[PDB]
Design an enzyme around this catalytic site. Sequence first.
Site, PDB file in Angstrom:
ATOM      1  N   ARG A  29       0.753  -1.338   0.246  1.00 45.61           N
ATOM      2  CA  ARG A  29       0.101  -0.003   0.130  1.00 45.61           C
ATOM      3  C   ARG A  29       0.932   1.122  -0.169  1.00 45.61           C
ATOM      4  O   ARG A  29       1.497   1.449   0.976  1.00 45.61           O
ATOM      5  CB  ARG A  29      -0.672   0.050   1.178  1.00 45.61           C
ATOM      6  CG  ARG A  29      -1.671   1.244   1.466  1.00 45.61           C
ATOM      7  CD  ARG A  29      -2.737   1.114   2.722  1.00 45.61           C
ATOM      8  NE  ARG A  29      -3.625   2.006   2.956  1.00 45.61           N
ATOM      9  CZ  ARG A  29      -3.529   3.065   3.854  1.00 45.61           C
ATOM     10  NH1 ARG A  29      -2.668   2.931   4.877  1.00 45.61           N
ATOM     11  NH2 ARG A  29      -4.221   3.951   3.961  1.00 45.61           N
ATOM     12  N   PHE A  33       2.206  10.672   1.035  1.00 44.61           N
ATOM     13  CA  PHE A  33       1.700  10.246   2.121  1.00 44.61           C
ATOM     14  C   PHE A  33       2.831   9.332   3.069  1.00 44.61           C
ATOM     15  O   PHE A  33       3.563   9.521   3.751  1.00 44.61           O
ATOM     16  CB  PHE A  33       0.174   9.603   2.200  1.00 44.61           C
ATOM     17  CG  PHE A  33      -0.377   9.128   3.541  1.00 44.61           C
ATOM     18  CD1 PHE A  33       0.272   9.476   4.571  1.00 44.61           C
ATOM     19  CD2 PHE A  33      -1.382   8.261   3.678  1.00 44.61           C
ATOM     20  CE1 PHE A  33      -0.202   9.149   5.919  1.00 44.61           C
ATOM     21  CE2 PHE A  33      -1.798   7.690   4.622  1.00 44.61           C
ATOM     22  CZ  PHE A  33      -1.235   8.254   5.980  1.00 44.61           C
ATOM     23  N   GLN A  62       3.728   1.498   2.902  1.00 47.12           N
ATOM     24  CA  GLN A  62       3.321   0.550   3.840  1.00 47.12           C
ATOM     25  C   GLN A  62       3.891  -0.663   3.361  1.00 47.12           C
ATOM     26  O   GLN A  62       3.786  -1.030   2.197  1.00 47.12           O
ATOM     27  CB  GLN A  62       1.698   0.707   4.247  1.00 47.12           C
ATOM     28  CG  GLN A  62       1.632  -0.167   5.215  1.00 47.12           C
ATOM     29  CD  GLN A  62      -0.094  -0.053   5.499  1.00 47.12           C
ATOM     30  OE1 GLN A  62      -0.681   0.859   5.255  1.00 47.12           O
ATOM     31  NE2 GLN A  62      -0.421  -1.167   6.279  1.00 47.12           N
ATOM     32  N   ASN A 116      -1.112  -0.227  12.161  1.00 47.27           N
ATOM     33  CA  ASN A 116      -1.858  -0.928  13.327  1.00 47.27           C
ATOM     34  C   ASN A 116      -3.378  -0.837  12.880  1.00 47.27           C
ATOM     35  O   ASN A 116      -4.031  -0.388  11.893  1.00 47.27           O
ATOM     36  CB  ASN A 116      -1.821  -0.025  14.448  1.00 47.27           C
ATOM     37  CG  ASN A 116      -2.256   0.953  14.958  1.00 47.27           C
ATOM     38  OD1 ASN A 116      -3.360   1.569  14.452  1.00 47.27           O
ATOM     39  ND2 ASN A 116      -1.502   2.042  15.303  1.00 47.27           N
ATOM     40  N   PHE A 158       5.286   1.708   8.184  1.00 47.74           N
ATOM     41  CA  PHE A 158       5.246   2.761   7.008  1.00 47.74           C
ATOM     42  C   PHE A 158       6.445   3.522   7.185  1.00 47.74           C
ATOM     43  O   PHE A 158       6.783   3.728   8.306  1.00 47.74           O
ATOM     44  CB  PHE A 158       3.682   3.476   6.922  1.00 47.74           C
ATOM     45  CG  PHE A 158       3.472   4.071   8.077  1.00 47.74           C
ATOM     46  CD1 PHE A 158       2.845   3.243   9.278  1.00 47.74           C
ATOM     47  CD2 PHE A 158       3.705   5.614   7.909  1.00 47.74           C
ATOM     48  CE1 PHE A 158       2.495   4.052  10.423  1.00 47.74           C
ATOM     49  CE2 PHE A 158       3.054   6.272   9.219  1.00 47.74           C
ATOM     50  CZ  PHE A 158       2.513   5.530  10.141  1.00 47.74           C
ATOM     51  N   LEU A 216      -0.878  11.556  12.850  1.00 48.55           N
ATOM     52  CA  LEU A 216      -0.682  10.298  13.346  1.00 48.55           C
ATOM     53  C   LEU A 216      -0.070  10.089  14.859  1.00 48.55           C
ATOM     54  O   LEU A 216       0.041   9.047  15.364  1.00 48.55           O
ATOM     55  CB  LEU A 216      -0.146   9.304  12.250  1.00 48.55           C
ATOM     56  CG  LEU A 216      -0.755   9.162  10.843  1.00 48.55           C
ATOM     57  CD1 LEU A 216       0.180   8.350  10.018  1.00 48.55           C
ATOM     58  CD2 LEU A 216      -2.115   8.625  10.955  1.00 48.55           C
ATOM     59  N   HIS A 265       0.016   6.070  16.406  1.00 52.68           N
ATOM     60  CA  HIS A 265       1.048   5.039  15.522  1.00 52.68           C
ATOM     61  C   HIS A 265       2.294   5.486  16.306  1.00 52.68           C
ATOM     62  O   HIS A 265       2.872   6.557  16.486  1.00 52.68           O
ATOM     63  CB  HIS A 265       1.127   5.295  14.035  1.00 52.68           C
ATOM     64  CG  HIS A 265      -0.108   4.932  13.486  1.00 52.68           C
ATOM     65  ND1 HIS A 265      -0.363   3.665  12.865  1.00 52.68           N
ATOM     66  CD2 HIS A 265      -1.385   5.808  13.240  1.00 52.68           C
ATOM     67  CE1 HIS A 265      -1.631   3.930  12.381  1.00 52.68           C
ATOM     68  NE2 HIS A 265      -1.973   4.992  12.603  1.00 52.68           N
TER      69      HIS A 265
END
Length: 165
Positions: free
Chosen positions: A55, A60, A63, A102, A113, A122, A126
């Site tokens: 992903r 951004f 991942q 997660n 990531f 985040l 995270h």
Amino acid sequence: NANPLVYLDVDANGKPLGRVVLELKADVVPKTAENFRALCTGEKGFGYKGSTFHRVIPSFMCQAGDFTNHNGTGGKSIYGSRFPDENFTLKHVGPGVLSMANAGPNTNGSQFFICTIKTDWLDGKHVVFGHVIEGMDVVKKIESFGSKSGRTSKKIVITDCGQLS
Ligand SMILES: [Cl-]
Ligand SMILES: [Cl-]
Ligand code: NA
């Protein structure tokens, strides 16, 4: 003085993108660092070698870490199926931050990531546990193969990984 260095060698459709070296902040999050370290060496009999960046979202993050299902549904930690959020001391300060993906509070497994922007929304959700020492250019290459849905345009493979120190 005791932060591990680990590496990921990454390919896109069989072409080498290069090596990402990560410093794992064992001085702040030793349990999270140890999980990732052992998944890179594969010393428990499973880990990241031959898994993918499944992903990737441009502007951004990239991942990876689902070495069981290769799609975001799988992965596991060296401790068990999941392990707690160790702390939120380190923040998503900018590109090159290494942080745990997660499924809500205290659901860390093996997915992670690498940020390509400051992802400060985040923070507190995270666990940040390291940063890119070498190979941000490789991360930017991975990012270039992403899409807004996260589907990668090439198959992005961690062909080798391990612990450097
Ligand atoms: Cl996530
Ligand atoms: Cl897809
Ligand atoms: Na290796």
